[PDB]
Design a protein around this ligand. Structure first.
Ligand code: IHP
Ligand code: IHP
Lengths: 209, 13, 210, 13, 208, 14, 197, 198, 192, 14, 14, 13
């Protein structure tokens, strides 16, 4: 990534082994759950397009998602080339094309110069936007159950039901307040309907303990 | 397509 | 978070993978026990609203608590917008626009804006303001997830007085303590209850029931 | 609502 | 804690996740053994009262010891307010009525007011009361078994002596109780060597 | 009592 | 490796125990295709001495190590052909001191012998993962009730291991739908996987 | 410890836990002594006292270490009428210890007190040595490597004089090998690497 | 070790200490423990080298062979070099830390750390050769894959230290006939 | 005795 | 052969 | 012999 050292200058730094293995293990353990999206964004903090490609290339397996991520990058990069039609001035750098933001047609020297420029072109954060966008499509596609198929079990605690509710809701990405009470057990559903609309989740869960 | 099917990420086209 | 480098300047740095994983495992192992509140505050030391959002978004599962945490943030941000309606206009060169509630939460503010507010002189610690909202909602989550009540904590038949007092103040810590000195001696075993009633400090109470 | 149900923390509305 | 950076200035730094987990795990594993006292003191090196509070708050369970620690802090803060009627009050040293800025100001002052070490002194003191209380046996109840090795007996002796804590009683119990509670096989040997012998000589004399 | 039963360390009283 | 310090100068630093153990454990656990970029990332800025240290720390897999050695010999013999200045044996770190390797890399203009030697290693490791690929892309057919997601995962994983590009693009558009289960009869990959629930 | 300008630094949680763990795992094996000296690199007498106070259990050994520190401090007070109690960190403040160590010319009270601690740990390791060298024979099907490992491991702990160690190696090592290997070892004056596969 | 600040001595790190003791505990004396020692001892003084070898518990057979190897190399250093560091000064036994630092920081330098590490790595290579369980002459391939046989061959060759001849000579008649008819890449693809 | 039986290391005497 | 069988990477030849 | 059997590394004669 591009980090500021103790002297105060923005310099490149090798992606750390702790960051590499943390990304590899979080993909091995959590596959594409909704919470690997921010973990990727956190581990790729200040990352260059070269560091982003390295994180994705280190991912073994899940190649269906890897290819869907590539086709998303192709779409966003082709849109960037449609929005940004491109000698360069002696204090400037060439306007980065979509393939340059992706790190395929750009050297690490070119990427650092776009990120450390003033005014900057954060090709690391632009390429990370395309990656995160494609990863959200993957998590949405990898969501097993629908929110309409989430009903409270016979004796399932209301806490465990709400946990599964907003877990599936988070993965699938309006009718949150109405479907939650509508898919509870008649035991808790009658209690929730009694409180009426405008009740908070804290009041609803304390009402079904 | 900046990335085609099969190549790694960051592979020069 | 935002830290002071060797040069003495306040500068942003990326949230470390050690901090990230330590927060994930503490939530995985301890769920929402009372001691997860200070662990969150310690691991979020100097954190920006973006780092705070990152720590909460890395929490897998517990989505009921996550949603209650979101609704608590919505209440405190709506209260902040009630107390700080910004008189918009040409914000002064060298000054920052007054942060609304959504900016303190990190939803409508960039990392550059959050850094500018926190490193300002005088500062607007949006990181500590947003952390205050998170800690508040987490306290409501720990209060809710408290399994047993303090009224249901009675000393077991041959349970040691130490283990009873441990379960007493542990349940007293999760729930929120008026009758702390009365209910403790009252729910002991008749063996120890008579000794405690005869004395009329917890140090003295536990040395008396060894 | 600054944060909506199911939307992540720091989500641009 | 407050540390000196590479540039040489005393500056506050966030308590590290390594130090946080090391303290949590040493409380989970060793509970309140005597060696938890110096481990707390070493992990809290240069810590502010805010950092000290964070370490104690991170302790899950052991709330009996936590409350005894609180009441000891109350007693030591009440005695500080009696001895010292801006000068930091007792609640300020405990970190409850003082901001992190005020605490840093007192510690980095020239001359300094080490509210971190004063508050740590109170915590260490209450933790010594907890360790002395959690000591299962008394030093008077430590007698060498029938065929228990003299090493195991001395290990249990000075482990109980360390937990029960102070000096006049420990020095007298060492020279007298140790030989007095050994089994007659080793006890007659230790009395033959008599006082003035070192523990190294006493244990080589009872290797059987 | 600067620190109250059940209440955390470093808690603003009153 | 060679890293820029806080002072802003490119200086040598010892290869870290965290980097060493990370490489040893990645080799022990996985020559998978994803071991190639893990070696490139852990070898970031590494001098040929550090690369030699990373390869020597690999226990077992001596057939791959020997095939890696023979590839380095071929590329070094090819470098000596092209360049009759660091000779090929100097880039490999066998006839070059650490001082000489640092001098080439820190030169202005530089001779990145660390990245030239890493290029030969990455090339030999690509020949190893190509050889150890168990199945062919032609032998990848969707299972009886194997989900289309798991079939596509096994398709491109076999395709990634069996690395030309005209072959990959043609095998993707043709063989993927051709080897699917008939229930195939049913565009982007996202549309294709959403269409085969 | 005192690290480089020479400034004091708090003993690190990694060094603390590495010392507590190496005492918990290895008790008082001979390699604990150089592990203590390595973890106490540049340590003040206060940092040394912290490492020993963090040792839970082994209080018989801790008490023998104290009595050894008492002997060497009492010998220091005889030779130097910093006092021995100042070197031990009991009667000296951290500022006084930093002054002695950072002086020019310095008085390395850290290294003087560590020399007392190391000496006491040697007496502890010697005492805790379970088996004697005259009881390390090879056995039926124990590999010669494993037998020589146990031999010099028992030789290292018992800390005999160097004249005894040298002679015990040339004589007792081949004498206690099984007749399978003992007959192959036999020409005299061989080195350990010559002594072959068995 | 001796490291450069933004050249000064530094205490050997606990991470370096624990990694070395754990790599010796796990991998004993496998061939890949030699570069791990060299990388962990990067920039190490003879004092820091002695510390790494002294922290090694057990394996005292290898420790003694390592000592006797150092004695031969130090005696050989005293023969070729009759204050200039003698062999005992390079081993750290007769030299103080200030003396060793002065030799390593000299301009021109006398890298007593790299000279003493050379003697250590040399004795370690002898140890790994001794600890090789089988000989390369006793490494033969019924239905064992040619990949696994080559793995064991060059692993025994790496520790022991007629490669091209004995490799095809000890293969089973199935692969031996193919190899005798004919690079290792070509040899392994020919017996797949 | 610089260090007393049972007293910790670095214990201030007197 | 820049690297020989059995010899380690970084091995000085001859 | 600079180092003797059983004597530690760096041991003064
Ligand atoms: O693994 P490292 O590369 O050694 O880096 C970190 C950390 O620095 P960074 O996280 O900013 O890279 C410090 O080492 P340096 O890199 O600064 O030299 C060190 O802590 P100290 O500065 O106190 O020595 C220790 O700390 P931590 O992991 O807690 O961040 C270390 O990591 P490891 O010791 O675990 O390897
Ligand atoms: O392995 P890491 O990713 O670095 O994380 C830590 C860490 O490292 P080590 O396992 O190599 O020692 C701890 O050690 P330090 O970095 O503080 O030196 C260790 O615990 P110890 O302090 O006892 O060595 C252990 O912690 P844990 O008990 O949780 O396994 C471990 O794993 P974690 O990442 O889970 O903390």
């Amino acid at each position: 990534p591009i980090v500021q050292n103790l002297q105060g200058q923005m310099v490149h730094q090798c992606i750390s082994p702790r960051t590499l293995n943390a990304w590899v293990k979080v993909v091995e353990e959590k596959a594409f759950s909704p919470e690997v999206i921010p973990m990727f964004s956190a581990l790729s903090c200040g990352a260059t397009p070269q560091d982003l490609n390295t994180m994705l290339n280190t991912v073994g397996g899940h190649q269906a998602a890897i290819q869907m991520l590539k086709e998303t990058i192709n779409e966003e990069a082709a849109e960037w080339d449609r929005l940004h039609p491109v000698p360069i001035a002696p204090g400037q750098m060439r306007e980065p094309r979509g393939s340059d933001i992706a790190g395929t047609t750009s050297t690490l020297q070119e990427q650092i110069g776009w990120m450390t420029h003033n005014p900057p072109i954060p090709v690391g954060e632009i390429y990370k936007r395309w990656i995160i966008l494609g990863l959200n499509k993957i998590v949405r596609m990898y969501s097993p159950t629908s929110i309409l198929d989430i009903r409270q079990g016979p004796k399932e605690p209301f806490r465990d039901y709400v946990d599964r509710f907003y877990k599936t809701l988070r993965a699938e990405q309006a009718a949150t307040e109405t479907l939650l009470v509508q898919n509870a057990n008649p035991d808790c559903k009658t209690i929730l309907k009694a409180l009426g609309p405008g009740a908070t989740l804290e009041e609803m869960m304390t009402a079904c303990q | 397509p900046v990335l085609f099917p099969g190549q790694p990420f960051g592979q020069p086209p």
